[PDB]
Write a protein that binds this DNA or RNA. Structure first.
Ligand SMILES: C[S@@+](CC[C@H](N)C(=O)[O-])C[C@H]1O[C@@H](n2cnc3c(N)ncnc32)[C@H](O)[C@@H]1O
Lengths: 328, 92, 88, 108, 76, 98, 108, 94, 83, 99
DNA sequence: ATCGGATGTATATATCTGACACGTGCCTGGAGACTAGGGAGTAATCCCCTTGGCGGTTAAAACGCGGGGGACAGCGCGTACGTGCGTTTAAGCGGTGCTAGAGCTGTCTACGACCAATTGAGCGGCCTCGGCACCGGGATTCTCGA
DNA sequence: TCGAGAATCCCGGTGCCGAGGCCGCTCAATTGGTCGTAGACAGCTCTAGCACCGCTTAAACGCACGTACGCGCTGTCCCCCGCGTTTTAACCGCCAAGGGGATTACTCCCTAGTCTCCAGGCACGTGTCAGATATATACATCCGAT
């Protein structure tokens, strides 16, 4: 009726009901469990030697005993090497961030247990700012590696959706506190389930993340003018926001500090921005825009590569414009 | 008592190139340019109000007529230029 | 579950080699180089994504989510191509 | 009452909003004209004229001239990729053509 | 007597009629109680298409009979 | 055995398809092509079935008329086979690639 | 009063003068519409439709058909020299193409 | 709910005067409706532009006539002018 | 007052001068009667439309705007003469 | 014994001369006579503003120069250097004029 | 050039379905009659600008000679495309079912047309200086024959 | 590989007319109300678009041979380019005359608008024949062989 796994780092055990939560046509998530064992197999790189002699790649998951030969034995044969829990060497420190392969598995696993009907995410007004789309694991990993977040930056995702972007950032960056705000009620409802489920599968592997908060709200409100300007790095997926609210975001971004980073789907400033007397109040005056390297499967609504752009606030460009306006 | 855009084209030079001029032969080409894209945008926005059985041309019909007529990056920066002027007109 | 959209991926292959022969036979051509088919899949790639996008943007102006037969007519007839029989 | 402000000044524009609004009413385009429609349209026409005068003033400087001649408007439009798409069916009087010799024609 | 006018949507209504009432009178009473116009109604009695000129007693309709309503619309 | 000379069956297919009016692209791969170009607009689109037939009728009329000009460019160069530089020379004079 | 005569019947036409007059008033073409303008325009549209149906009914007879099919409209327009000038930028659905093989391609 | 309008009654009357024994399919009648609506918008759109060039606010049969000369090729424009003037002189006589 | 054979006033040096703004470096001898036939067909189409704009205005002078209007409805719109 | 350029050198020098200038290339009085004799077949005594004859010439210059650009592409496509009458006919056929 | 085998193709008769074409009732849009107001027809007048002619200067067109480069035909070779046969992939079809969204009606309010009064922006005319065109004289470069 | 020679760019001067700034003055845009209706919005309904299913088989895919076409090479020759002399007429500047473009005033007849009315065209239903299909046969077309 159920089947249980035990944590290596002493956390609460897991639950898998025998009326299985099959999700798509064929991933039929016992593949979730047999791949969950393989990441705890090397944490701790000695489950492969502790469990070589009897197991092999096995089909026929429709029987209850095929998991049962694998799962309670995993609750049992863990103690062939867990038994060193006392006396001379502790297990792994909880202050470890996961690898990119482990983090990809946890974020896929937290997504499967959280969203129940992903076709509900398509319930929006057409061509509105509230359309839904996602950024893949590979672009956010590109985004984290091509900004350089120090130990004092603050990350905010405007329009966080279900919140999978801030979970990858909070588990791959040593910063203070991260935020995500979402207006639409359907992905913000899944974001609360996504919030709880990320934490309990994070102590289960025994890994730390930075602290975060997923909120409901509208970032175009007066509460958010003060706290957009006080953050260091901003992620936003503005692909279908439209020009009326992209114009509103520019006059919130104009109060950011020096070295303020902005990663967006569409640019807030041209790549070939020439400054003259006609566009001195534009936001491209005070920022430098570069296009990141595009990768395959970068977004979730199309298959072709969509490239996101990087914005860096510097108020040393308009001065260099003013440093050649005087002597001729 | 005949009108043109020559006063207004000459103001846009001094913002862009503050120490160049135009000849009068090329000012007349700039007046032919402004009248041409006036009747392209207003002609396409007239059909958009008629396809949807509306009787009013608003700033939304001008916006989607710009997106039909201008190519690529011209349409991106004319839409952001037009929405900046409308939101400044309605907040003043 | 997974996911909110099933992404269609290639679909230009799609327009196959014995379908380009038998578009060129109506054009009246007798012999065809082997490099035509990749050239022809790129033209019908540029075309038909100029028609759509100019077909959508008539759909979003009508607030309407469903691109109809009109707005394909009006997409064509804007690019200098008038199509009869769908019908305006 | 208060001193009159033009609609171009409160929109932050250089082109006349009131003249564009009159030309939309007297052009038989629709029965009725919204209030933001001449503000939006005058901003697009001011943007498009600022791009040509940007590029034509650069072409006048490359020939060491301080005035824009119809040749400089021709060189500006045909060397910009997107201005050449708008004005591809447009001929400019006393504009000439771009210098372009096919590479086969050059001597060996 | 009464009849049952079943629709194609799943709605079966109870209408108090008389055998001298025509099909034109049946199509007039549903507009009085449901708001459906007379050019949007087709009636079914054992596979027949009923005509406005004849009455209910001309087609041998017993009380508590199931009449089906095919929804015609002006265009398509 | 029996075997036609090359060019004979090809001329037989000129007469076959210039006589008919049918669509020559398969309908489900074309419809699947249309729905994946429209994925670039983020939002969900629905495509009334008469609109996909209007796109296919126009795309095939575009390509048949393009192979007619492509064929004239190959005959002009004293060739009988069409070649990718014939498509490029036809689309440049027509005013498409420039 | 006297029994009503349609404006098509007193002009000797088959096309509706009163419907064309309504479409000119509701199409934003001018502020005002003259009385002879829908009579003139309905006679031109009736003339142009009588030429195509002349030539397409001849094309339907050459294929031993008694109904006009979109192929017969295509064969009528493309074989007439002046109907091909009007409808040169027009594609007709399920119309096909004219049979035309270049003389170089024919076998020796 | 709203009823439609087309030229299908009138195209069918012209066809019986020209070929009284032939018929027409429904897809060919939809192309003839597209043809009449296309030539209507060309003539009325050009005649609208002629009244604006000459600073007039009315469209008369003089402006339909010269829009027919601008749009139709040579012999089509010759016969369509003669068909149009024949209808106006019959309309204004009685 | 009758005026005839003026395509020969468009000379061989003038057609050669037009081909070299077009980028042609060598010209066969049969080009010059082709170019006069192409230019006659082009001028007949524009003047026919320009004269029927000035007949409708009830004038006897072909103005520059009649030429600009005639060129615009052939796709060949032209800046620099008042349009 | 006199100086003598090889054939093709002066022609390329004339490509660069006339692609730099913006002047009209047809003589003005022979062009004006041609306009006045084509117009005799439409209306009997026309009057022709001098700006209208210059608008007709500026359009005819631009039509022919753009036609010789496409004519030149058809001659290179046939691996030639000379333009021939079949190059003009192919260029007008694809453009949609000769048909 | 002719001949026969084989493959395609046109020919004729049957049979069968669904779409054209006809008919009927009905409602809404076109027609008849009338009034009021202004668009344009009509005339008259002004003066701009088009036409016609003239003469002189000289740039450009025309004519011819001469020679080399390019068009064109022919030939030979190798490759890549057509033809056809066997294998394999998925299109097409028909049928079922859900549900959503496009189309519709009914309130209702905010937005734009209309009108009147007022004034400053833009247009016309006006000086006037400087950009640019012209002219000449110098250096630099390119083509061509060695 | 290098000197002659013919174009071409570069560096200054003179002269000028067209672009730029100033000013005076209407008239068109702004201000301010006001009304009525277009459009936004909520609710409701049911057509049609999406998705799935299994099956049949049309069509795509893959393979292999061979043929004919692309393409490169060579040689001929004539036609096109370059140049110099002569000839023609474009071009400029000027004068003169008058058709007709452009404007203004006046008034009339034509069109918008209104209400009443009624008949033509639309929706709906129904029956039959045109055309599609199939099969079998007749015959025209291609191609290897002689
Ligand atoms: C394209 S989704 C991005 C989801 C997430 N950031 C990701 O890439 O995985 C953009 C989201 O922004 C949300 N959004 C739009 N306007 C918003 C606003 N004004 N305040 C908060 N969220 C908003 C919409 O609900 C939409 O779901």
């Amino acid at each position: 009726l159920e089947l249980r796994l035990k944590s290596p780092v002493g956390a609460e055990p897991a639950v898998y009901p025998w009326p299985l939560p099959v999700y798509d046509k064929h991933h039929d998530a016992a593949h979730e469990i047999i791949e969950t064992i393989r990441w705890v197999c090397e944490e701790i790189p000695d489950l492969k030697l502790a469990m070589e002699n009897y197991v092999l790649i096995d089909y026929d998951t429709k029987s209850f005993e095929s998991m049962q030969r694998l799962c309670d034995k995993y609750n049992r044969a863990i103690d062939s090497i867990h038994q060193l829990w006392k006396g001379t060497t502790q297990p792994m420190k909880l202050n470890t961030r996961p690898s990119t392969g482990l983090l990809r598995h946890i974020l896929q696993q937290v997504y499967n247990h959280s969203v129940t009907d992903p076709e509900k995410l398509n319930n929006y007004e057409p061509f509105s700012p509230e359309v839904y789309g996602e950024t893949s694991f590979d672009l956010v990993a590109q985004m984290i590696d091509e900004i350089k977040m120090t130990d004092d930056d603050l990350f905010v995702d405007l329009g966080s959706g279900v919140g999978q972007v801030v979970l990858q950032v909070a588990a791959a960056t040593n910063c203070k506190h991260h935020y995500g705000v979402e207006k639409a009620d359907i992905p913000a409802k899944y974001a609360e389930t996504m919030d709880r489920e990320f934490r309990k599968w994070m102590k289960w592997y025994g890994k730390k993340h930075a602290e975060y908060t997923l909120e409901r709200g509208d970032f175009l409100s007066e509460e958010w003018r003060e706290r957009i300007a006080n953050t260091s790095v901003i992620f936003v997926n503005n692909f279908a926001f439209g020009p009326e609210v992209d114009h509103q975001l520019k006059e919130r971004f104009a109060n950011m500090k020096e070295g303020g980073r902005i990663v967006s789907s569409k640019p807030f400033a041209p790549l070939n921005f020439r400054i003259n007397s006609r566009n001195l109040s534009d936001i491209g005056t005070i920022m430098r825009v570069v296009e990141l390297s595009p990768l395959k499967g970068s977004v979730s609504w199309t298959g072709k590569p969509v490239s996101y752009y990087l914005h860096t606030i510097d108020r040393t460009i308009l001065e260099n414009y003013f440093s050649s306006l005087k002597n001729p | 008592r005949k009108e043109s855009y020559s006063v207004y084209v000459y103001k846009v030079l001094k913002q862009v190139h503050p120490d160049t001029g135009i000849s009068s032969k090329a000012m007349g080409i700039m007046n032919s340019f402004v009248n041409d894209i006036f009747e392209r945008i207003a002609g396409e926005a007239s059909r958009l109000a008629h396809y949807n059985k509306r009787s009013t041309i608003t700033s939304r019909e001008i916006q989607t007529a710009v997106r039909l007529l201008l190519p690529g990056e011209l349409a991106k920066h004319a839409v952001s230029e037009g929405t900046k002027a409308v939101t400044k007109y309605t907040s003043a | 579950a997974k996911r909110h959209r099933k992404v269609l991926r290639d679909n230009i292959q799609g327009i196959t080699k014995p379908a380009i022969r038998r578009l060129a036979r109506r054009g009246g051509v007798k012999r065809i180089s082997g490099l035509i088919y990749e050239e022809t899949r790129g033209v019908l790639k540029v075309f038909l994504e100029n028609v759509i996008r100019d077909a959508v943007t008539y759909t979003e102006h009508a607030k309407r989510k469903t691109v109809t037969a009109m707005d394909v007519v009006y997409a064509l007839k804007r690019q200098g191509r008038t199509l009869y029989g769908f019908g305006g | 009452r208060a001193k009159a402000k033009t609609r171009s000044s409160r929109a932050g524009l250089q082109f006349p909003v009131g003249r564009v609004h009159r030309l939309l009413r007297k052009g038989n385009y629709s029965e009725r004209v919204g209030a933001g429609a001449p503000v939006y349209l005058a901003a697009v026409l001011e943007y498009l004229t600022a791009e040509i005068l940007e590029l034509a003033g650069n072409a006048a400087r490359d020939n060491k001239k301080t005035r824009i001649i119809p040749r400089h408007l021709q060189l500006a439009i045909r060397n910009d990729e997107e201005l050449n798409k708008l004005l591809g069916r447009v001929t400019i009087a006393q504009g000439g053509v771009l210098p372009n010799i096919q590479a086969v024609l050059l001597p060996k | 007597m009464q009849i049952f006018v079943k629709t194609l949507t799943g709605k079966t209504i109870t209408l108090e009629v008389e055998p001298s009432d025509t099909i034109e009178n049946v199509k007039a009473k549903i507009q009085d109680k449901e708001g459906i116009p007379p050019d949007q109604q087709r009636l079914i009695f054992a596979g027949k298409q009923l005509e406005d000129g004849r009455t209910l007693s001309d087609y041998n309709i017993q009380k508590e009979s199931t009449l089906h309503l095919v929804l015609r619309l002006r265009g398509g | 055995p029996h075997r036609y000379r090359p060019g004979t069956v090809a001329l037989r297919e000129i007469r076959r398809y210039q006589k008919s009016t049918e669509l020559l692209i398969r309908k489900l791969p074309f419809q699947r092509l249309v729905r994946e170009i429209a994925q670039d607009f983020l939002t969900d689109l629905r495509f009334q079935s008469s609109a996909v037939m209007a796109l296919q009728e126009a795309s095939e009329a575009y390509l048949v008329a393009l192979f007619e000009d492509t064929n004239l460019c190959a005959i002009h160069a004293k060739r009988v086979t069409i070649m990718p530089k014939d498509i490029q020379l036809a689309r440049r004079i027509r005013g498409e690639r420039a």
